[PDB]
Every structure is written in C-alpha cells, then in structure tokens.
Design a protein around this ligand. Structure first.
Ligand SMILES: Cc1cc2nc3c(=O)[nH]c(=O)nc-3n(C[C@H](O)[C@H](O)[C@H](O)COP(=O)(O)OP(=O)(O)OC[C@H]3O[C@@H](n4cnc5c(N)ncnc54)[C@H](O)[C@@H]3O)c2cc1C
Ligand SMILES: Cc1cc2nc3c(=O)[nH]c(=O)nc-3n(C[C@H](O)[C@H](O)[C@H](O)COP(=O)(O)OP(=O)(O)OC[C@H]3O[C@@H](n4cnc5c(N)ncnc54)[C@H](O)[C@@H]3O)c2cc1C
Lengths: 450, 450
C-alpha cells in the first residue's frame, strides 16, 4: 500500500514542475521539501522590501528559454523586459572603462583577445558537447586541469583574464583554480555558449516575472495543496522490487517511484538502501555547490542613467561583482543588483558586515556617481547559509569528476529518477534546466506507471 | 537542564577516546553514533572469518605512534609485529621486479630517480609544514595544481610515476588528477614523510593488535555503557549562549559542549543553527572521502615465502594495489591483504564482482606463484558503501581548499569543538591522529568546564 504513485523530493522549480506534470495527468503525487517554503534557489517577496517585489534567488529569463515563459504564462504571470539602454561598464580594479551599449569600449586594447578567448572557449565546449561530455575523446585531459591553468596557457591580457575570472566566480560560484576546465567548457556550451551566458541584455538575461520568480513554485504548491509537505527533509531512500520508501527521520512515505529534484550535494546527505551505484555516489559527494551572494540597493531613481550608463558592469579585480540595473517600470524605487562569488565571496566574507556595505557603496560611487550614497534600502542574500542548499548559483565540479562520474547526472537508479537542473541535457544551472529535467523525469516515470 | 556536560558525535577511535578521557575525569558524556556499531573506519570480528580474527578497516600501528599502543595496553590488548622478512615486490603492469628485503631491486634503473622524487616530495611538504600549511608562503601556488601535474613536471621515469600513483590512490583514496599537490605534500609531511607512510615493515606499518583493531572502540563502549547511543545519526546541531542541542530527527540531547569526532564530509550532512562560519562550511562541503576497498584472501600457508618473498608488493599500473602478508602467528590460516583506491578502484568497480575475484587471484598467481589458486576464503570490504562513512582511508582535498579553508580543520566554533583524525596536528588520516585530535578536543572542553 502506497501513500502516492510518485514522491518528488525538492520543491524547487524542477520538483514543483515534475509534481505538476504528474498531478495534471491524474498521478497521485507527494512533493516533499526540506525548507519551510517552496522555491529552492528561487525565492521572492512581493511586500517585505520597500520599492516593490524583490527576488533573493534566481530571477532572469533567457531569450531562448521556452518551458519557463510558457509555465509562467500558464500560471497567469506577466513578463517585463530586463533590457536597459545605455553603456555597460568594464571596471578593472576600480579603473572604469565605458562600453558602447553592451559592447567593449571603443578601441579597447583587449577587445581582440577577448573575442579570440570566447571563440576558443566555445570551441573547447563544442569538442565536449552536451549529450555525453564524459564520453568525449578530449575530456580526460581537459578534466585534469583547472580553468585558471587554461587561462594561463591561452590568455595574455590581464583584462581578458579578469573578465574570465569574474564570469567563472559568478556563473559557477567558484574560483578558476577550483573548477575543472572540462566542467566549465561543458557548462558554457550546454548554456548555448559564452555570449549567451554573459549577455547583459541578451542571451540568458532578457526578462523577469512581475511579482517575483518565487510565484512559479508558490502557485504550483497552491494547486498541489495537502500533497506538499514542507519541513520534510529527506534523510533516507530505500528501494525494493515494488517501490520506494522515503524517510524524514522516522516519518515515511511509500510510492512506486521517486524523483530526486535537488542538486547532487543534496543527495549526498541521504542514506540509500541499497547503496547507490559508484558513479552516482562519487558524483553526489564530489560535485559541490558554488558560493554566491546577491546584494541589492534601492534608490529613488536609476541615477546611473545621468552618465548615460545602463547600470550593467563587469566589476573586475580582487573583489569582483557582476552589477545590473534590476529596476522594473512597476517598481516605486530603482534597484542595483550585484553578484559576488567564489574567491571574491571568500574575500567579501573576510570583511565585517558593515565593511561589506561600505565597500559596495564605494564601488557604486566609483562606477555610477556620488548619488550612490543616497541609499533607501540595502539587502544581501548570502546563499552559502541557506539550509539544505548551502550555495549558489549552481553545482560545479573539480578536476577528474565529470570524466569519471558525469554519466550519473541523468541516469535513473532502479525506481529513483533524477531531476534538478543538473540533470538537464541543456540549460543545466538555470531555471530552464530545472524545468526541462523535471519534464524528462515526469515523462520517464509516467511511462513506467502505464 | 542538560542530558550531559558533553555530547561526542561519532564513535570512531577519535570520539571513543575523547568520551573516555572526559568520562575518566567524572564528566557526564553522551557518545552518539550513526551506525549500528562503534569503530567507524576501524571494524573487526574475532569469529566471523575462518583462520582467525579479521580487520575490515584500519589495523596497522606505526613505530612512532604512542597514543594508540598506550591505549591498547591500557585496555588489555596485545600487539604483534607485522614485519615479514623476505623480498618485497615492485610490479609494473604485471612485470615483476624483486626487491632486496624492503629496498628497490638490485640495480633497478629507476632507483635513483625514485630516491630524488621522495626527497623533492619531502622538501615540498617541509615548505608547508603541519602547524599551519594554509598560512605557508608557498601554499597558494601548490594548492592550484594537482599531484598529477607535479609528477609531470618533476618525474620522468614511468616506474617512479606508477609508484607515486599507487601511493596517492591508496594513501589518499583518490587519483593524482583529483588531489591538490599542496594537500598531498602537507598530508605526507604531517605523517613524518613519504618513507614513514610507504614503509612495508617500518614507519606507519609495523604492528597489529591481536584480536582486531575494533576492540579499541568496543572496550571503550563497554565501559561507557548506557551513555553510548547507536543508531543515532546526528542531523542538526543548534548552539546558544549556554549550550548545544544535538538532534537525530526529532530526538534531542542537550549539553554544555559538543565534540564533532567525524570527518568534515560527515559534518556537511548536518544542519547548523546558527550556520557555521564560512571556511568551516566550505571545508565540510568540499573535502570529500577518498575511495578504497580492502580485499583479503586466506590460504593454508604463506606460500609466497617459498619464492623468498615477504608478500608485500607495489602492484602498479591500471589496476594498482598495495599488497601485504596480513598473517599473525596466532592465526590458523595465512592472509594476503590488498588495498585498491581512487582511479584504480573506479576500474575495479567497472568489473563484475566475479571478474574482480578472478582478477585478484590472477594478480596473486603472477606475483606469488600458482598456489595462489588454492584459496580457502575471499572477502572484500568496499568502504564507499559504508553508511555515514562513504569512503576510505582518509579525507582528501581538491585544488584551492587547503589554502582557502584549511584553518577550519582544528578551530572550535563557539561551543562545538572538532576532533576526528582530520583535526590532528600530526598523523591526520591515521588512528594515531584520531586519538591525538580526541585528546586535544577533550582537554579544550575540560578546561571550559572548569
Ligand atoms: C543568487 C542566484 C541567482 C540566480 N540567478 C538565476 C537566473 O537569473 N536565471 C536562472 O535561470 N537561474 C538562476 N539561478 C539558478 C536557479 O535558481 C537554479 O538553477 C534553479 O532554482 C534550480 O532549480 P532546481 O529545482 O533544480 O533546484 P533548487 O532550486 O535548488 O531546488 C531544490 C530543492 O530541493 C530541496 N532539498 C534539498 N535537500 C532536500 C532534502 N534532503 N529533502 C527534501 N528537500 C530537499 C531544497 O530545499 C530546494 O527547495 C540563480 C541562483 C541563485 C542562487
Ligand atoms: C581500509 C582502511 C584501512 C586503513 N588502514 C589504516 C591503518 O592501517 N592505520 C591507520 O592508522 N589508519 C588506517 N585507516 C584509517 C583509520 O581507520 C582512520 O584514520 C580512523 O578510523 C579515523 O578515526 P576517526 O574517529 O577520526 O573517524 P572514523 O573512524 O571515521 O569515525 C567517525 C564516526 O563518526 C560516525 N558518524 C558519521 N556521521 C555521523 C552522524 N551524522 N552522527 C553520528 N555519528 C556519525 C561514523 O559512523 C563513525 O563511526 C584505514 C582506514 C580504512 C578505511
């Protein structure tokens, strides 16, 4: 006797979507979540911050994402463009260089090497591919070196190296010395290439949902009602020939199938009986979360526009950030959003909380003008202290893992299927990846219930 | 109101010893253990195997270890020498080279480069030291490269490279492509150097306890009686100004202090409120267990002695092992013990269980003679599937961790102290390290109770 046909573990976008798809087909589903809320790495509030709704977690929609805007449209949400006209900045240890709209500065001496370094990164990624990078002829050697070592071999310009460093520390939440070059190259390729992922007004960053991204999982949970269990951290998965028992301490739920819709690092904390096969076990233990904080400051007006700036900036150097204008037309304040990750977040963490705030305002004053001192609101979400997540924005892998265990990202283990963005064939790391992996896992389980 | 003055988490050698020291001073202690037994990475049975007691986990005592033999003597255990006269083997993809006792073969062409490679490894280790390798001027650069890259830069001989590869894959349970050179160099230095750790009849490998190493923790648990809780996996640690609450799901124990006597990977599965400081959090999430299996075959007689062989062998190549004669004079059969780790264990895992057994016998036949076919008993302990351990013999670290978070191996966090072998100033990775770290943590807490 089963409590459900399928138990979905994790109420992020991936698990929420998988649960919705199965529920919509008349499958009996339970959606179990460790935290006191749904959303996972997505997390927003309409009312808690002055100036309008605010997203603490992921919030950008990409121009080639289709499951995410289609689901948002089905749930009654509306999008708005994130595209901000004006010059992006490229800042090198506080030395401001003004872009031409989203392009490198007019006759920057590093423009040509940046272009070549992006072509070479794309080419390395193409050699790996997204379907089976672990099976690629090139992968063993690339997976034995770090991104930092690849930069030392292939990049001469300090500017180009600093741009690559901010992008790895943010997009993977980890230092170029910590990430496998094979993992990085694969990651960027499977996100439609480097220009896709680093777009300030194109590629992965073009739109938002009015009212916050957390609405996606909240509206799904409303419809699932009593089949959602919060404060239900999964501690043990048992499997036998007829089903799966999922435990939260002594609390237990029995189903025919289970979908793990959480990162490999989440899986590593659970006890499996029988034990997982070896590649999946190594993958869970050795693919950690990156580290990222999201800092937001609100103001009366997007005063950066007085210098004709977009508010986007590659803030490069020892305390690197990716900065955006996060303002919506429906908001009553303007927002600057800054991301800081990996080794730059380690430095950020070494500062006192008051030093961090003062330092972030000094950056904004340097880049955007003195009106940056006239703050209305200052907030940080440090993803490293979020219980049952412990990092952001994504899973990364150190040397030797992708080539030896990557095939375990996607493969079911008996009656346990993997969703979560890390299992998506493309757009792993993104909400779109979360939905595609949820779709895949719901379809696989639905075929096994028929 | 407290259930105890101190809760010790983990009944390996480290936690068992810390609990004993506090208990012996009249401190009220609870010792909580996830598994259905004590011992952790130590695990033995006097009666379950034919031919005498057998150790599934760690069992060697080193010639410079003093807490381990002193504790064994206090508990009424007896030691026996593990030293086996005769020629050790050096085998390169099945090509047998016969040592002179424990020394390289007479006029081996690789003898000189092996000697130089050991001096250079020792020198790199000395530059880091054991007291604070994370603070060493050299550490950032060494911690940005793998052991494999250091071998490619410093070692020319295929034989020397294959010896280094079997030693890293066994002593760290991980591939030379996965381990930071800084972590490896530090690890070997803090174990009194490479010759210490690779001794077949000297250094770290000279003696055993008659009746098995599991006796150490079992006899401690007998005296602690009802203050030992088995099947009590810690899921949450909460701290406040007056004490520590330790949870196993809804079950809870309150004390004034807590000692975590388990690897950083064990800590990563627990939820901390308040959250841990950042370096300790990164350390727990990113310092994984190695992978190791221990294969044992018993025979009527140590037939290898008919060729004048000790039974020790560096079995090098694509399926590498460290082999020992594991026979005690009090045993009624002779034992060959083989360790296989890291990338060699990945290959081992890719074979069927029957292929693995056939392959191990073919190795023994090649090295030691045809009488290796006349088996009495065959057993494997795969440490990767042991619940709440998930690996062996030790914690390792990938690039970038030791230099950025290593200072969190030893430092208390408010009322939570760290024991476990990984916190030992020297002999981290070893039972001796486990006892020294338990001693340190019990002394620190005892001073705070006074
Ligand atoms: C600061 C930040 C900014 C980002 N920006 C963007 C962006 O702009 N665009 C984009 O596309 N993506 C972005 N992302 C990434 C995006 O948030 C993730 O790709 C997405 O949320 C992944 O969805 P998921 O369902 O696979 O996993 P998660 O969102 O991580 O959900 C996993 C769920 O599983 C739960 N869980 C964990 N362990 C257990 C357990 N033992 N028992 C039960 N439940 C458990 C977790 O609590 C969580 O709710 C960002 C992320 C962060 C951190
Ligand atoms: C195959 C093998 C051979 C080895 N050979 C040798 C050798 O010859 N000589 C040598 O000196 N060393 C050897 N070792 C290493 C030695 O076994 C370890 O260094 C030693 O056991 C470490 O002791 P420890 O107490 O620090 O940790 P552990 O032995 O790992 O004990 C930790 C305990 O914490 C428990 N625990 C984990 N998570 C939780 C939780 N959430 N709640 C409660 N409890 C928890 C575990 O179950 C475990 O019992 C070997 C190890 C292996 C695997």
């Amino acid at each position: 006797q089963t409590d459900a046909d399928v138990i979905v573990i994790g109420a992020g976008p991936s698990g929420s979507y998988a649960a919705k798809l199965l529920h919509d087909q008349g499958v009996r589903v339970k959606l179990v979540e460790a935290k006191d809320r749904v959303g996972g790495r997505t997390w927003s509030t309409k009312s808690d911050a002055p100036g309008g709704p605010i997203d603490f977690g992921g919030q950008w929609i990409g121009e080639t994402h289709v499951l995410l805007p289609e689901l948002g449209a089905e749930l009654g949400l509306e999008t708005v463009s994130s595209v901000k006209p004006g010059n992006d900045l490229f800042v090198f240890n506080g030395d401001v260089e003004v872009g031409e709209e989203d392009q490198v500065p007019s006759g920057a001496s590093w423009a040509g090497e940046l272009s070549r370094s992006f072509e070479l990164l794309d080419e390395v990624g193409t050699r790996l591919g997204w379907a089976a990078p672990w099976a690629s002829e090139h992968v063993g050697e690339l997976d034995s070196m770090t991104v930092a070592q690849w930069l030392e071999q292939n990049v001469q310009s300090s500017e180009v190296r600093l741009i690559h460093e901010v992008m790895v520390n943010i997009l993977n939440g980890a230092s170029t010395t910590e990430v496998s070059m094979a993992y990085w190259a694969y990651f960027v390729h499977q996100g439609e290439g480097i220009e896709s992922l680093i777009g300030t007004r194109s590629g992965a960053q073009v739109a938002w949902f009015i009212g916050g991204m957390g609405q996606v999982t909240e509206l799904i949970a409303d419809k699932l009602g009593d089949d959602v269990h919060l404060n239900w951290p999964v501690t043990r998965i048992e499997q036998d020939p007829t089903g799966v028992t999922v435990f939260s301490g002594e609390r237990r739920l029995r189903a025919s199938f289970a979908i793990l819709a959480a990162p490999p690092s989440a899986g590593s904390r659970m006890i499996f009986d029988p034990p997982l096969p070896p590649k999946r076990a190594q993958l869970q233990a050795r693919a950690p979360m990156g580290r990222l904080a999201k800092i937001q400051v609100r103001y009366d007006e997007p005063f950066w526009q007085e210098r004709g700036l977009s508010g986007a900036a590659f803030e490069c150097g020892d305390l690197a950030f990716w900065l955006f204008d996060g303002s919506k037309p429906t908001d009553s304040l303007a927002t600057i959003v800054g991301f800081i990750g990996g080794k730059h977040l380690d430095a950020w963490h070494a500062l006192s909380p008051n030093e961090r705030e003062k330092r972030f305002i000094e950056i904004l004053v340097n880049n955007f003008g003195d009106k940056a001192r006239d703050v209305r609101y200052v907030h940080e979400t440090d993803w490293t202290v979020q219980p049952w997540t412990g990092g952001a924005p994504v899973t990364f892998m150190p040397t030797g893992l992708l080539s030896s265990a990557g095939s375990a990202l996607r493969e079911p283990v008996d009656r346990l299927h993997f969703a979560g963005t890390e299992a998506a064939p493309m757009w792993s790391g993104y909400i779109e990846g979360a939905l595609r992996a949820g779709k895949i896992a719901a379809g696989d389980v639905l075929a096994r219930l028929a």
